[PDB]
Amino acid sequence: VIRHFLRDDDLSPAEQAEVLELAAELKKDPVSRRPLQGPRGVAVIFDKNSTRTRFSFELGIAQLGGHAVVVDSGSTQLGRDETLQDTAKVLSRYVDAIVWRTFGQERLDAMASVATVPVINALSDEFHPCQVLADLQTIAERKGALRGLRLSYFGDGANNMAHSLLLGGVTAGIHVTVAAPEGFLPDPSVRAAAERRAQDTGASVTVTADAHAAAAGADVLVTDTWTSRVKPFRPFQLNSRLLALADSDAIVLHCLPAHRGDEITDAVMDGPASAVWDEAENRLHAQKALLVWLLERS
Amino acid sequence: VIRHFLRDDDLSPAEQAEVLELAAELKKDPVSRRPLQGPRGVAVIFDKNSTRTRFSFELGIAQLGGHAVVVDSGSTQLGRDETLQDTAKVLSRYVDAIVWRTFGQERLDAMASVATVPVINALSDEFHPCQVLADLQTIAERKGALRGLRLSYFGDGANNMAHSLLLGGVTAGIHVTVAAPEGFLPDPSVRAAAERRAQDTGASVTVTADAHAAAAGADVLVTDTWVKPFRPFQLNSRLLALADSDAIVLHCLPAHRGDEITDAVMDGPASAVWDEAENRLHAQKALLVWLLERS
Amino acid sequence: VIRHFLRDDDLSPAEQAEVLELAAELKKDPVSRRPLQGPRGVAVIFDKNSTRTRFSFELGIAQLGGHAVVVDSGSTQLGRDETLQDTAKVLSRYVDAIVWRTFGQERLDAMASVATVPVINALSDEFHPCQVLADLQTIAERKGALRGLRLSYFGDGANNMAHSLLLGGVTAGIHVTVAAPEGFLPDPSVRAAAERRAQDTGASVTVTADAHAAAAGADVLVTDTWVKPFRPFQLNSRLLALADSDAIVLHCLPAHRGDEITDAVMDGPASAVWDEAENRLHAQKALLVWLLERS
């Protein structure tokens, strides 16, 4: 009974492999799977609006045969006028899955503890597991492989992207380096779980403040905006020079939106190493795959 | 020429049975009717926002083959920039029905005086007839025949729910009782029309401040979110004990647990609240079908 | 390769003829053409909300088999957070076209410059070309051939409807007149481009401050919302009578009855205002279809 996806480690490696395999299949034949045919409903809920998250979910649902019901931040926020449990119980009568952008993980857990349909974290304060799914797919297609690559993330190590890349990466078997200054380290319990999960996949977790050392011989370079007070992040800028220390075949990822000239330069964003646009496109195929997998299991 | 749904008594007892029988058919086979295949448009319009009305309507529309165009209260309110008549006449060209959540009844009548397609009260200040259709549907799946049951409503006796349970209940032949505190009674015209409808069906209308007497021998106990005068009207286990042993509890939602209802009642075995939310879809679906095929 | 629609003259006269003719076929058979079957996505984005635009576009898209993702003025404005070029490249990966209600023309040009799918001007500060297609469509069904007809616009000569009726009107072969007061002239370069386009189609452009004269003999009388020196330009029974006996009136909506146009004109027998509003749906499908097969 009933699977959810609130954080990257909610999947096991084999299960993450299956989902990513299915993402490959769906990119090629986007309307070949129709488990939401009817149309069946899926809730798409935003505590804070995210436009790229709405596009990719809303079209991806429609393409699986369903109808996304989308609700804004312009509505009464979910836990204010009734408990989240009540909202979950009611929504479970209307839709086959619940996709939710929100704040703390405790709110996701609350909803997921009583729902009779899958709950999916669209993007939270702590995690961004749908983005990492698309990151991994973009890596799979660009490099032909996943296990054993060396991935480096630069910038705020406490942000949602840094956590997810840690958890999602080691699940995929990727050696993850987080390159972050001073006091912008990963939340410790996230780091412990990523190390624990790494012991089953042959991966590892490295945290350092040395942006040169983290860039050296890396296969993938990743960065995010400096908060989604900026003096400490400048050595961590993805520029031509830093990318020149990476493997010669290395690729660059950015979940977007980018602030060109701060965390990433125009040469690197617009250059041959950048997978940024395919990555963006891949939000659509990954989340599609996620849903199918979840629905056939629930 | 054109049937609308603005209040529970726009349908006749005979016709309300048709909609209800159809709603049970639709619960069993949710995609078997496709009158909106095309897709044809339906307008879904919110002067004040309602999440659960959005879910149920929008989905039910899609499952009839059509497509709902949803506008929020994050857009210019309907009667300000142009007359309600003008908007009605334009919408009429784009959609086959108009589903509107709005305030005063006069706004609904203004829109429905000139529309060439059915107009539906999604929810308003004065009635909530789609909720009562869902209420009657779930009552019917638990206790069979509707004619003759005793239904009591507790809480603010002047809000849209009481008006509608009054209007809807007697339509279906149920004996409706509003239990309200001293300064909170139904609109007297709604009250009188309910008494006028009840004569056709064998029903009756009671208004009282006696929670204990209203709860006694009751078949169905209902409440809505409400305040010191309201507390003796609370749906609690001690109030439930006075009811019939087979009694059920409905609540239109959201609940404010610890006020109008209690955790033990709403999560207890007499609670029908979840089936009650679900049937918003089925009832509204069947309403669309019924109206479209008669327009 | 890749055709956009940001101003009316983005289409050549022959290209325009095609779209309009298609509009009539799609009016007669709304679900006959299905290029976005899948559904494929189209972006519908509003820097500024517009209810009637949402309706026509969203259902248009649904009836070609696609799915409209609609984003409101209630999200971050489209350029404040990432550059437009980046937005365009990303949307080009999700949708097959971008429909956009924005402000300055340079914002549309920016998006159009790097997107790999058609970009459409749903409404902007300078132009409203989608409305004029609907206007042209409605004039065609009333009077037959468009060539050589006289159309006069009344009110603010500098607004988006004024520009678009000039460029769109002369593109169809229509003698366009703007009746505007004082210092409410058309943009000089828009007027220039209208004059060139008119030499091509063998039509003409007139701009005057004499309403009486502009009304005289005209086939089509048009107006938009406005406030003091516009009062001699009102569409009243008087001004209508000075036109041709078989004239028609258009108004893009919403109308402030009593100001730019009176009750008796608007609810009269020369008023094509509701057909004009219906045809927003049909003309924008035709544009979608046309632009898509060329991209």
- B39/B45 Cα distance (integer angstroms): 18
Task: Please give the Cα distance from A102 to A201 (Å, whole number).
Answer: 30
Catalytic residue from among A9, A255, A285, A287 = A255
Which B residues, 36 through 75, put their C-beta within 8 Å of a C-beta on chain A? 49, 51-52, 54-56, 58-59, 62-63, 72-74
Q: Give the DSSP H/E element, type plus range, for residue C95.
A: strand C95-101
Chain centre to alpha carbon of residue C163 = 10
For residue C139, give Cα distances in angstroms to A13, C147, C219, C244, C274.
64, 11, 9, 14, 12
Q: Does C142 touch chain A (CB under 8 A)?
A: no
Starting from the edge strand earliest in sequence, which strands make up the sheet with A205-208, in order?
Answer: A205-208, A175-179, A150-154, A220-223, A251-254
Q: Are the C-beta atoms of A6 and A105 separated by less than 8 Å?
A: yes
DSSP assignment string, B146-209: -TT-EEEEES-TTSHHHHHHHHHHHHTT-EEEEE--TT----HHHHHHHHHHHHHHT--EEEES
Q: What is the largest CA-CA distance in chain C?
A: 55
Could you tell me if B1 and B289 are in contact, meaning their C-beta atoms sit under 8 angstroms apart?
no
Structure tokens at C159: 């607004």
Instruction: Output the six-digit token pair for A170.
Output: 């080691």
CATH superfamily of B1-130+280-295: Aspartate/ornithine carbamoyltransferase (3.40.50.1370)
Pairing, β C220-223 against β C248-251: parallel
- C-alpha span between C132 and C122 (Å, rounded): 11
Residues in A closer than 8 angstroms to B73, CB to CB, are 74
Determine whether the interchain pair C90/A30 forms a contact, defined as Cβ–Cβ distance below 8 Å: no
Q: Distance from B90 to chain C by nearest Cα, in Å?
A: 6
- C105 phi and psi angles, rounded to 5 deg: -65, -30
Report DSSP state, residue B37: T
Question: How far, in Å, CA of A36 to CA of A118, rounded?
Answer: 13
Neighbours of C166 (CB within 10 A): 32
Contact C28, C143 (CB under 8 A): no
Indicate the length of chain B as a whole number.
295
Contacts of B56 in chain A (CB under 8 A): 94
Using CA atoms, how far apart are residues B229 and C226, in angstroms rounded to an integer? 53
Strand partners of residue C208: C179
Report which residue type is found at A272.
P
DSSP code, position A101: E
* β-pairing verdict for C150-154 and C119-123: unpaired
**A51 to chain C: which residues are within 8 Å by CB?**
71, 75-76
Cβ B255–A82 below 8 Å, yes or no?
A: yes
What distance separates the 2 farthest-apart alpha carbons in chain B?
55
The nearest CA of chain C is from the CA of A31 a distance in Å of 6
Kindly write down the DSSP assignment for every residue of A226-253, as one continuous string: S----GGGGGG-B-HHHHTTS-TT-EEE
CB contact under 8 A, A55 and C67: no
Q: How many angstroms is the resolution?
A: 2.7
State the best of A69, A99, A117 to mutate against chain B, taking most chain B CBs within 10 Å: A69
The residue in chain C having the minimum alpha-carbon distance to the alpha carbon of residue B62 is: C62
For the record, the structure tokens of C173 come out as 């072969």
Give the determination technique. X-ray
Look at C59 and B41 and tell me if their CB atoms are within 8 Å: yes
Q: Which residue, chain included where needed, has tokens 């007139």? A: C206
Enumerate residues 6+ apart whose C-beta is below 8 A from B276.
B134, B135, B138, B250, B251, B252
The total number of residues shown for chain C amounts to: 295
C-alpha closest to that of B203 among B137, B136, B123, B134: B136
Look-up of token digits 């991966």? A203
* Contact (CB<8Å) C93/A59: no
Among B186, B143, B141, smallest CA distance to B161 is for B186
CA angle centred on A217, ends A214 and A221, rounded to 5°: 60
CATH architecture classification, A131-282: 3-Layer(aba) Sandwich (3.40)
Bridge partners of C175, per DSSP, are: C150
Query: Per residue in A38-65, is it b (16+ CB within 10 Å) or e — as a string?
Result: bbbbbbbbbbebbbbbbbbbbbbbbbbb
Distance, CA of C253 to CA of C273 (rounded, Å): 8
When computed from its CA atoms, the radius of gyration of chain B, rounded to whole angstroms, is 19
Q: Residue C111: count other Cβ atoms within 10 Å of its Cβ.
A: 24
> B254: cis peptide before it, omega within 30°?
yes
Do C3 and C96 meet the contact criterion of CB atoms below 8 Å apart? Answer: no
Q: Which of A36, A46, A49, A59 to mutate to test the interface with C (most CBs of C within 10 A)?
A: A59
Could you give the strand order of the β-sheet that contains C119-123, starting from the edge strand earlier in sequence?
Answer: C67-71, C41-46, C95-101, C119-123
Q: C124 is written with which tokens?
A: 């902007």
What CA–CA distance (Å, rounded) separates A216 from A244? 9
| C277 CB-near residues (< 8 Å, 6+ apart) | B89, B90, B93, C52, C134, C253
What whole-number distance in Å separates Cα of residue C230 and Cα of residue C247?
22
Active site residue A29: no
DSSP 8-state secondary structure symbol assigned to residue B9: G
User: How many residue pairs from chains A and C have C-beta atoms closer than 8 A?
Assistant: 54
Helix axes C13-28, C273-292, angle to 10 degrees: 110
Rg (CA), chain C: 19
Q: CA B124 → CA A156, A286, B92, B139, distances in Å?
A: 49, 41, 21, 23
Q: Judge contact between C177 and C218, C-beta under 8 A.
A: yes
Asked whether residue C294 is marked as a ligand-binding residue, the answer is no
**Residue B41 pairs with which residues in a beta bridge?**
B67
Taken in order B271, B275, B281, B285, is the CA torsion positive or negative?
A: negative
Radius of gyration of chain A (CA): 19
Which pair of tokens denotes residue C104?
A: 């300055």
User: Are A47 and A77 a contacting pair, CB within 8 Å?
Assistant: yes
Contact criterion met (CB below 8 Å) for A77 and A101: no
DSSP output for A70-90:
EE-TTS--TTTSS-HHHHHHH
Residue ranges of chain C assigned to CATH 3.40.50.1370: 1-130+280-295, 131-279
CA–CA distance, A44 with A120 (Å, rounded to integer): 9
DSSP codes of every residue in B63-108? TTT-EEEEE-TTS--TTTSS-HHHHHHHHHHH-S-EEEEESSHHHH
- CATH 3.40.50.1370 for the A1-130+283-298 domain, yes or no: yes
Structure tokens at A234: 């400048």
- The count of other CB atoms within 10 Å of the CB of residue B288 is 27
B91 chain-C contacts, CB cut-off 8 A: 55
Instruction: Please give the C-alpha separations between residue B288 and each of A232, B36, B42, B115, B122, in angstroms, as whole numbers.
Output: 60, 9, 10, 16, 12
- Decide if A90 touches B, using CB distance below 8 A: yes
Task: Choose the catalytic residue: A16, A63, A131, A137.
Answer: A131
Shortest distance between the Cα of C207 and any Cα of chain A, in A, equals 44
Locus of tokens 């520009």: C163
- DSSP letter string, C215-282: HTT-SEEEE-----TTGGG-B-HHHHHTS-TT-EEEE-S---TTSSB-HHHHTSTTB-HHHHHHHHHH
Q: How many CB atoms lie within 10 A of CB C16?
A: 23
Beta bridge partners of C5: C120
**Is A87 annotated as contributing to ligand binding?**
no
DSSP C189-227: HHHHHHHHHHHHHT--EEEES-HHHHHTT-SEEEE----
Q: Which chains touch B (3 or more CB pairs under 8 A)?
A: A, C
Q: Is C128 annotated as a binding residue?
A: yes
- Name the nearest CA neighbour of A98 among A75, A80, A78: A78
Biggest distance spanned by C-alpha atoms of chain A: 55
For B245, residues 6+ apart whose C-beta sits below 8 A from its C-beta are none
Kindly state the DSSP code that residue C9 receives in the 8-state scheme. G
Q: Give just the sign of the alpha carbon dihedral A142, A147, A148, A154.
A: positive
Supply B211's token pair.
Answer: 């929670």
Structure token pair of residue A284: 């659509």
| Residue A131 per-residue DSSP state | H
CB A207 within 8 Å of CB A178: yes
CA gap C186, B202 in Å, rounded: 71
Residues 6+ apart with CB under 8 A from C98: C42, C43, C45, C88, C91, C111, C115, C117, C118, C119, C120
The candidate with the shortest Cα–Cα distance to B217, out of B260, B252, B246, B250, is B246
Chain centroid to Cα A169, Å, comes to: 10
What amino acid is encoded at C234 in this protein?
Q
CA quadruple A203, A204, A208, A212: dihedral, nearest 10: -40
CATH architecture of C131-279: 3-Layer(aba) Sandwich (3.40)
Of B54, B254, B281, the CB nearest to A71: B54
Torsional sign, CA A126, A131, A135, A136:
positive
Parallel, antiparallel, or unpaired for β A220-223 and B67-71?
A: unpaired
Closest by CA position to A206, among listed A180, A232, A183, A228 = A180
Q: Where along chain A do the CATH 3.40.50.1370 domains lie? A: 1-130+283-298, 131-282
Find the CB nearest B75 among C30, C51, C255.
Answer: C51
